């Protein structure tokens, strides 16, 4: 169970340097001892080795320069969780501190002087080319512009923002996973020995999926840090890249002045479920390293990330005790909805890509949609959509491009509810779509009702006083070898009951919160073309989204901001539960 991980993209691999990650409760004395054990063992086999850095604070482990011949030996070491081969990354009121991991910076530019502090942390790979020389270049450009976009006097988003610079990218805008890791551990160690003030970390870089980089980000996020990253400039799924793929970081895609996704030569902004939202990222005026009062127009998802870091810094100067869940929910709440032209993205990536462009704001129930990864084609394969630790799973739906689904279940897994979608016999696979909310003094629980084929007992509701129905899930309960017969719908009397087939188990989300008020809305078309829609009004938050009738006419259903969308085949109805506080 001690595994070896290398980058999927061969040209971005950096063999010779390896991150040895140890098990969770490994003390510094054990990491140092394990590092020395590797050196001694390697020397016994006649190999020089160099322990570049011993990790402590963010994760237990060490960084080692050695031959790949010694891998099988290092995987046999005690306490090892996994070994990851290093790879390259590339460039893409209260006082809040914004950490910037990027290039060097012109700290004396008028746009950012007095607001930027150069930390002296420096960790970059050597530049490519035997005769490469910076000469009159100060390797300032990317970093200076981004510090300006975050907090520049005249062209910045959060003009009143403190910033701290760490050099993790060289003159060619290239860094390593190992160097970024060390920069994140620096930030953590600063947090421990310094204040209890809000921290924003801007990671305007991207590399191939990295198990260790994503873990390091997850650890800083759980310690209360707000990480904002570029989605990537590869016109590709951001789940294949890191830190983009890490679910705890806030991944930002780039859009232009005509609300189009940004094009960068033959590539452009990344897309898909791992992108939290989009922001301005084309022709962005910001500080230029050319002179202390110069400006310059740049484009990319790092520009887009800097806008969100600015917005976060503004939000945190106002409410400094705001949690990361609260901030992500607020970022999504205030963004412009359904303004992006989704034509530019691959057709099968549009549903999964959010239609949100960031914006500043001008108690309350906030919900966001969380899409799962696609399940496999196995008939018993499942997809899982998870909420953030602080959030409630208020509803769970599913969707298949073929419509071959068994339904879905809101079930406990590791003490927390998850939205599990089940594939059907002969199905290509399915998606699970969670609706994750922040509800004040909520006491929620899911109640499972059984298949109801008798003439009574069909009505499923939150029969408990003070508990209100926020969402329904339906799971088909007839065996694949049993005689199939057309599903029969459970009748409708009361309006605030689950909708579903008599042959299915129903999972009801019942919440008890002080001023929680929840209602059902419907809208059906007889022979719909592609879809049916129903939306919560201004002041209401979509909590649940279900479809009617079953598989025969429907591919699935999913929330899209406050609109419940039901994807029909060639009387289809969209049933939505709209909820609100106080």
């Amino acid at each position, epitope marked *: 169970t001690a595994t070896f991980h290398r980058c999927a993209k061969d040209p971005w691999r950096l063999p010779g340097t390896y991150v040895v990650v140890l098990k969770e409760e490994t003390h510094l004395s054990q990491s140092e001892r394990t590092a020395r054990r590797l050196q001694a063992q390697a020397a016994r086999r006649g190999y020089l080795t160099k322990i570049l850095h011993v990790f402590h604070g963010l994760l237990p482990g060490f960084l080692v320069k050695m031959s790949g011949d010694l891998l099988e030996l290092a995987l046999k070491l005690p306490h090892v969780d996994y070994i990851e081969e290093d790879s390259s990354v590339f460039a893409q009121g209260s006082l809040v501190e914004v950490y910037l991991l990027d290039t060097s910076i012109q700290s004396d530019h008028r746009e950012i002087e007095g607001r930027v502090m150069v930390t002296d942390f420096e960790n970059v790979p050597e530049e490519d080319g035997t005769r490469f020389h910076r000469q009159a270049s100060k390797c300032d450009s990317h970093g200076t512009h981004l510090a300006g976009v975050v907090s520049g006097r005249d062209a910045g988003v959060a003009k009143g923002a403190s910033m701290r610079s760490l050099r993790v990218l060289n003159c060619q805008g290239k860094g390593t996973v190992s160097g970024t890791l060390i920069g994140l551990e620096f930030i953590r160690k600063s947090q421990l020995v310094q204040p209890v003030g809000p921290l924003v970390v801007l990671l305007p870089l991207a590399g191939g999926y990295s198990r260790v980089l994503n873990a390091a980000c997850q650890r800083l996020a759980r310690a209360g840090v707000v990480l904002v990253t570029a989605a990537g400039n590869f016109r590709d799924d951001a789940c294949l890249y890191s830190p983009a793929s890490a679910p705890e970081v806030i991944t930002v895609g780039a859009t232009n002045a005509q609300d189009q996704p940004v094009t960068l030569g033959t590539l452009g902004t990344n897309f898909g479920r791992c992108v939290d939202l989009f922001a301005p990222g084309e022709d962005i005026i910001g500080a230029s390293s050319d002179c202390s009062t110069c400006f310059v127009s740049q484009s990319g998802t790092s520009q887009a990330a800097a806008h969100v870091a600015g917005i976060a810094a503004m939000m945190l100067s106002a409410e400094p005790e705001l949690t990361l869940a609260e901030l992500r929910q607020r970022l999504i709440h205030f963004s412009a909805k359904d303004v992006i032209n989704e034509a530019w993205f691959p057709e099968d990536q549009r549903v999964l890509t959010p239609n949100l462009v960031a914006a500043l704001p001008p108690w309350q129930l906030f919900c966001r949609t969380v899409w799962s990864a696609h399940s496999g084609p196995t008939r018993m394969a499942t997809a899982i959509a998870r909420c953030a630790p602080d959030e409630e799973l208020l509803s769970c739906s599913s969707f298949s491009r073929s419509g071959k689904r068994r339904g879905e279940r809101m079930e406990a897994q590791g003490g927390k509810l998850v939205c599990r979608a089940h594939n059907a016999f002969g199905g290509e696979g399915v998606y699970a779509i969670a609706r994750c909310c922040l509800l004040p003094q909520a006491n929620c629980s899911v109640h499972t009702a059984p298949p109801a084929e008798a*003439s009574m007992g*069909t*009505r499923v509701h939150c*029969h*408990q006083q003070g*508990h209100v129905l926020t969402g329904c899930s339906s799971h088909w309960e007839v065996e694949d070898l049993g005689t199939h017969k057309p599903p029969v719908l459970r009748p409708r*009397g009361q309006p605030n009951q689950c909708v579903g087939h008599r042959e299915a188990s129903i999972h009801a989300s019942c919440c008890h919160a002080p001023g929680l008020e929840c209602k059902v809305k419907e809208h059906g078309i007889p022979a719909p073309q592609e879809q049916v829609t129903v939306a919560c009004e201004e002041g209401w938050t979509l909590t649940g989204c279900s479809a009617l009738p079953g598989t025969s006419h429907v591919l699935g259903a999913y929330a899209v901001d406050n609109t419940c969308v039901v994807r029909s085949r060639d009387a289809v109805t969209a049933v939505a539960i709209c909820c609100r506080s106080r």
Partner: antibody
Amino acid sequence: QVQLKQSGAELVRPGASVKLSCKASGYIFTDYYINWLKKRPGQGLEWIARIYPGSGHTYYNENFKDKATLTAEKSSSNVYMQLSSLTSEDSAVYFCARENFYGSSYVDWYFDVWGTGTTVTVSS
Amino acid sequence: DIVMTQSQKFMSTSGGDRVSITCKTSQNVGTAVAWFQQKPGQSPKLLIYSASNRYTGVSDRFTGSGSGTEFIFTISYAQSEDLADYFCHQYSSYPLTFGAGTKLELKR
């Protein structure tokens, strides 16, 4: 006259299977759900599964999904439960019970009639 | 899975005229709680359904109360004939869960 007659006590070798039965009378067999429950000496009753005899469709407790297999025989007017790969943890008294609904709510019902139980001893 | 935590023994009141057991749930089951009587070698007998409604034929000496997560079952003027095991069960969510049972003891 509404009643459930269960099959007699069983002895079975570890790794073997049993088919317990529950004979229904005095009411329309196909119209009511029938359930199976496990009772060990010091423990509280465990719900195993349920079946609608009208359609033979089952619904199980995930913990017994592999062990138990429910079935209905409209002619015989009785429901069956087969337990497979038995062990000493399955030595218990098994009861069958009928659900009677009085309303449209999924909580407008109760277990009105029960069988007397079938003792299952798993031993070499 | 909802957890039923039943009283270990019956607690007396009014000089042994009222005897009671409590049954507490891990989550809110509203009023979806029923109480049974089981005499050794006999099938459970439904007594109270929906937390406080008495099944047909059940004596008015048997009563049930409560809502949410605490439910009480009481026997007024307990007789020798009432010596049996008593158990609760929730039907708010599947899998259905039952209390351990409590044997009635009487003084003489």
